[PDB]
Amino acid sequence: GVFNYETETTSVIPAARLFKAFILDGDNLFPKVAPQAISSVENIEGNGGPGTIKKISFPEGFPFKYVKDRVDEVDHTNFKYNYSVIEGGPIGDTLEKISNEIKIVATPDGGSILKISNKYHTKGDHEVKAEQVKASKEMGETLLRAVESYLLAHSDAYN
Ligand SMILES: C[C@H](CCC(=O)O)[C@H]1CC[C@H]2[C@@H]3CC[C@@H]4C[C@H](O)CC[C@]4(C)[C@H]3C[C@H](O)[C@]12C
Ligand SMILES: O=S(=O)(O)c1cccc2cccc(Nc3ccccc3)c12
Ligand code: NA
């Protein structure tokens, strides 16, 4: 069945620039700006569009070794990005897929708001524990702050 989790978090970076950096150049930026969170990102198949498969590896000592994600949808106009965790880490005999949706919305002070939905597709009924979802939020949060700091510090990057 599906468990749906939503959250919002704010960013000090405008929506277009954050979308270009955080989403469209995430494979490059995450290993560089947050090495203690994501050790590498390998493009397995595809050009960044729908269907593209990537392998996200975590640093030594993390609960999981890696996950493989698949790009579902990329909407440059509304700054929407949908992707699914399809293999590895928690994927297995109790969790079939995590389907996530990120939308980034402009705020009038020059910042942005990121609205995130995670949908955990389980086999049988194995419930998603508060820490399966809470670990996920912290990680997303850590990556966003690390990209934010880099973009503040590198004003000519991603304009
Ligand atoms: C934001 C990028 C998309 C851009 C890119 O691939 O460069 C995506 C692609 C894979 C994503 C990671 C996959 C596994 C995790 C799923 C969790 O529910 C949130 C934290 C993690 C660690 C995700 C954080 C972030 O959502 C990533 C890194
Ligand atoms: O919210 S953040 O940390 O900002 C976040 C930021 C950027 C990308 C994210 C991708 C997936 C999940 C997140 N958090 C999340 C939210 C609810 C449940 C599980 C994970 C992401
Ligand atoms: Na839950």
Domain definitions of the chain by residue range: 1-159
Supply the angle between the helices 130-153 and 26-33 in degrees, to the nearest 10.
90
Q: Are 82 and 97 in contact (CB under 8 A)?
A: no
Give, in order, the Cα–Cα distances in Å from 32 to each of 35, 78, 96, 101, 111.
Answer: 6, 27, 30, 24, 23
- Resolution of the experimentally solved model in angstroms: 2.0
Q: Is 52 in the pocket of ligand 1 (CB under 6 A)?
A: no
89, 82 Cβ separation under 8 angstroms: no
Q: How far apart are CA 71 and CA 11, in angstroms?
A: 23
Spatial separation of the C-alpha atoms in residues 45 and 26, rounded to whole Å: 16
For ligand 2, is residue 38 a contact (CB within 6 Å)?
no
Cβ distance 10 to 113 under 8 Å? yes
Which token pair is 28? 């490059």
Q: Which of 139, 142, 158 to mutate to test the pocket of ligand 1 (most atoms within 8 A of CB)?
A: 139
Atom of ligand 1 nearest to the CA of 26: 7
Query: How far apart, in Å, are the Cα atoms of 117 and each of 5, 103, 151?
Result: 6, 9, 24
> Ligand 3 centre and the CA of 14: distance in Å?
32
For residues 26 and 14, give the distance between their C-alpha atoms in angstroms, rounded to a whole number.
16
Q: Is the torsion defined by CA of 14, 17, 19, 22 positive or negative?
A: negative
Q: Which atom of ligand 1 is nearest to the CA of 81?
A: 3
Burial of 40 (0-12, 13-18, 19+ CB in 10 A): middle
Strands 53-57 and 80-88: unpaired
54 CB near ligand 1 (under 6 Å) = yes
Pick the closest to residue 69 from 47, 31, 100 (CA basis): 100
Rg (CA), the chain: 15
Q: Is 137 exposed, middle or buried (0-12, 13-18, 19+ CB in 10 A)?
A: middle
Q: List alpha helices for the chain, DSSP H.
A: 15-18, 26-33, 130-153
Q: Tell which CATH architecture fits domain 1-159.
A: 2-Layer Sandwich (3.30)
Nearest by Cα to 156 from 20, 4, 2: 20
